[PDB]
Amino acid sequence: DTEERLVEHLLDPSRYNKLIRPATNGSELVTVQLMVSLAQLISVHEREQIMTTNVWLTQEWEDYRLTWKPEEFDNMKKVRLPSKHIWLPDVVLYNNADGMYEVSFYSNAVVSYDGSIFWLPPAIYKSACKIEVKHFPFDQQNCTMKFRSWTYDRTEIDLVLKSEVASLDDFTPSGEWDIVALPGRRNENPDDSTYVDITYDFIIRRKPLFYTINLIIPCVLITSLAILVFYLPSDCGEKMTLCISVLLALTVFLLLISKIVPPTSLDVPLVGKYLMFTMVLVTFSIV
């Protein structure tokens, strides 16, 4: 019964407003503490350079006008409130593709009596990270993701990390991909003096057995025949069929491994370079 009166007292548009942000004592900064938690890395499309992950981001901030006298309202400590109505500092990706920027669910927020608010919505994020494809597949991928308020600079809000490492208490084994470390760092730009943001760096390692058994064994299996075609006796007249078939198979594997690799012209996959070199060798063989 008293909860309804308490909520109507707090969320009255005549008294509380949404479009303005709280502050005291001559435009003091309202510190916002955000930390991330990786639920499970659900997919990494390397061809499109898109890492789709599940994220729980927790945000804490102090707010003064939402307080109340705890003794009056039957000694209530914390109250749930909808996210749409109370003010919330925007915290959104920048390098995000697919257009989608903000969070998905807009969950309820817990408000204490002192004024501290603690809010965490779920989210699915589609980060865009460059694919360092050099040691395929024995590679380490370095995907960066940025958090920064697209609406506020470092004149009203300031972002500070709570924990130096992303939490993994809710992590589940992804299968193909394996995490190594999850460092987060608060960047600073002295030239602009307003650009402030948080970068989390996911360093990921691919488990090698799948692609190994699938591609590497047939590759070396069929390329071990390039140096073998010569041992065939020439009177039989069968060098041509074997050698042309080997060259055709090498071209097919080259096209396939080029279609699976992300089309980045900055570096060369080592397997592709090896195959091109042995293809030149086998055409010198056929001539």
């Epitope: 360092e132 993994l168 394996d178 995490i179 470390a181 360093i203």
Partner: antibody, heavy 118, light 113 residues
Amino acid sequence: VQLQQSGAEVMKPGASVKISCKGTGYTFSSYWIEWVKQRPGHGLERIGEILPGSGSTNYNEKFRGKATFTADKSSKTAYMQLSSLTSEDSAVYYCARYLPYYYAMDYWGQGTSVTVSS
Amino acid sequence: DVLMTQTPLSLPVSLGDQASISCRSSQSIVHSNGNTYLEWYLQKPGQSPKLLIYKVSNRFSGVPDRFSGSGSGTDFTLKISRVEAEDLGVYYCFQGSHVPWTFGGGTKLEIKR
């Protein structure tokens, strides 16, 4: 931050010994925990590291099949099941936190002495 | 596994003398990003190891300036300016380039008279 280990442990050769690693004051299930073996004679050799969140484990090629780590998420405790133990592994065991490619190894344990003799 | 070779094994030097210790790798331990990840550890008798040098081109937050580290892509050298009574112990190398990780051999260091 703070780390705790188990007390002194003795056992006849061939049995199994399990030591505990307790960690407090930080996000326990967020980065690697590696253990260091120190023979009382000389040298420092590792035994392995684990990530208390996932089941990602690795071992040094020399100590394969000798130890098997285990992690718990509810209680911030890491255990290690030990295989057939011989008189050549009676040494002091450590525990430490580590995070690859970045700031790492800023704190340690206190040491766990295990002695195996008839 | 990339073995580590420390020189020398024992280097007695008096109080105030400059001491330089070399630590070589069997292979190249430079990462593709361009930073070499090596750690120097200091173990005292009866205590846990301490930190003095991480990311050799940088210095630890908490160790005095008397320690220094340098070297080329493969050869590495840890130098001390003035040995004090506290710097007694054993040094250790740690490479952080390839998996798995490994330690060094252990460099003994005491005073000489």
